[PDB]
Amino acid sequence: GLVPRGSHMLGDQVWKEVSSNTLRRPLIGVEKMINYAEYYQNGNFQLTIALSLDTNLSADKMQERLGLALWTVRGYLPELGTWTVGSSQDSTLDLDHVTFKAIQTVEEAQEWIEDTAILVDEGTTVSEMVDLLSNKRIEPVGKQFRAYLVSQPRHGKPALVMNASHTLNGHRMLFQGSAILQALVDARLTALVASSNSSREALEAVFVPEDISRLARKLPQSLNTAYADKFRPDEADVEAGFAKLGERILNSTQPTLGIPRFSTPSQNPQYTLGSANGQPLTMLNLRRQIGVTEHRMLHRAFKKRGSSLPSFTYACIVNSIDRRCKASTSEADEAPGANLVYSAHASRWFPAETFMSRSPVNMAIVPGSGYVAPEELRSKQRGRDLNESELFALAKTIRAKQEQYLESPHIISYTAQVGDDIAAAMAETANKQRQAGTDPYVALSENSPAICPPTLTSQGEVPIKNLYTPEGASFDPKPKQPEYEYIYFGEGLLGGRTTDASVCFALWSLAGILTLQAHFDSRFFDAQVIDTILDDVVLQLRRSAAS
């Protein structure tokens, strides 16, 4: 047992001790680009997810357990305590690293708990909390994760609402939320609360100073180092990555249809979620939800027709954008194509063990690209007004182009250098905009293209245990008035944040419920048009599944 199995050389060493009880590693790849965008673009990409709860726990029980449950989860998920904004010794800002401070005292632990396990004030609903959190950046900048318990809403079910930086997160939020819900019904925690006269006294009974020597192996690594450890890219693989970059750059310059942004940001936006702090809530998440039964039937119907739910949804988005906006980067009368902007998850090439406990990859985005030719998205008979057969053909074309682009993991090879260059250029652009006195919303839009190309990322259903009892997590169905404590989630809500002048569509599923949503700032795009596109897509999905 002296020769460990597997390939883990880089991942075993990325986190280094930089000071007492403090680990640090450099950010590499997409995670570095995200960290810079969150700092310089007001929290761009940050995530809010609400898990709506059925439970027989009172609000008071959930409130008195939340902080200790979070503390317990932190013990095996130190990723919750990472930080991405620091300074060098010359005092200059440092966005290039992630750090982890191992907590040594009860006082320090209690401070982290109170900053991270928030009890939401009476009345506020779950939907209101997702609106609020998605409409601002996480503070203080550098904080990676915060949990909000909505246990006293004036109507509706309670929820666990998580707000996270995207730098080291994504899919992982569901696993983090699941761990918190499981901890909330652990009998040992219930007994601890029952045996203690304050939450700090409960913490004192269990607290152990955190140990960097053993926690390093549980902290997340960049996808880039996991990629190097698994694939050991050689010169030809590196050059293959550059070829995928060149294809993506080319696709971004070819004539494309898309959604036109406003030439200048609206000073009086009418489409808001209310106001907070005297300013309107213009970050919108326009959602279309499809329930368990209909989702199952749609997924089957498209498969039976030789198609797929995600590829047909993409075809409908492309075609609706074309018909509703009639906007393209073609400087002539020529019909445009469509530049496809989308992400893939690294699980397409990496096994499940890459995303577990040992040096996990917690942000597994791999950028995709593709380009639909004008002849593939217009009909010689109908022009833009594609019939059902022509939409199925467009879906097939999209699916084939994505499968071709995503065949190889070596896309990842280009992202370290591109990440460095994009990050450096971001900081330089921000500096130039500050020197120019540019208005912040002008700064967030002036470098965005005039035409936003069709941007859809799809995530298929991944089974997650969503029932929690004192025996642990399980896939069993929601119980009907059991004798034992339980928490169950059958529905989630996503609030995405897109602060630059783009429109991002997301198709995803949780507990069998499918959501198609668009997130964007209504200061840059007409929300009526986006709502019309979403309605068009859902109507066509329903029509073509019934055909």
Author numbering: -7 to 539
From the paper:
In the MEL biosynthesis pathway, an acyltransferase from Pseudozyma tsukubaensis, PtMAC2p, a known excellent MEL producer, has been identified to catalyze the acyl-transfer of fatty acid to the C3′-hydroxyl group of mono-acylated MEL; however, its structure remains unclear. PtMAC2p is a monomer and forms α/β-folds which are composed of 18 α-helices (α1–α18) and 24 β-strands (β1–β24). The crystal structure shows that PtMAC2p possesses a large putative catalytic tunnel at the center of the molecule. Interestingly, the HXXXD motif, which is a conserved catalytic motif in the BAHD acyltransferase superfamily, is partially conserved as His158-Thr159-Leu160-Asn161-Gly162 in PtMAC2p, i.e., D in the HXXXD motif is replaced by G in PtMAC2p.
Two types of PtMAC2p crystals (A and B) were obtained using the purified enzyme. Both crystals belong to the orthorhombic space group P212121, while their b axes differ by about 10 Å. The initial structure of PtMAC2p was determined by the SAD-phase method using a type A KI-derivative crystal. Native crystals in types A and B were diffracted to 1.45 and 1.59 Å resolutions, respectively. In the type A crystal, residues Met1 to Ser539 and residues numbered −7 to 0 (GLVPRGSH), which are from the DNA sequence included in the pET15b vector, were modeled using a 2Fo-Fc map at 1.0 σ. In the type A crystal, electron density map of a PEG molecule in the reservoir solution for crystallization is observed. The PEG is bound near His158 in the cleft of PtMAC2p. Hydrophobic amino acid residues, mainly from α2 (Val22, Met25, Ile26, and Ala29) and α11 (Phe234, Leu237, and Ile241) helices, are concentrated around PEG, although a hydrophilic residue, Arg240, is also located near PEG. These residues form a hydrophobic surface in the cleft.
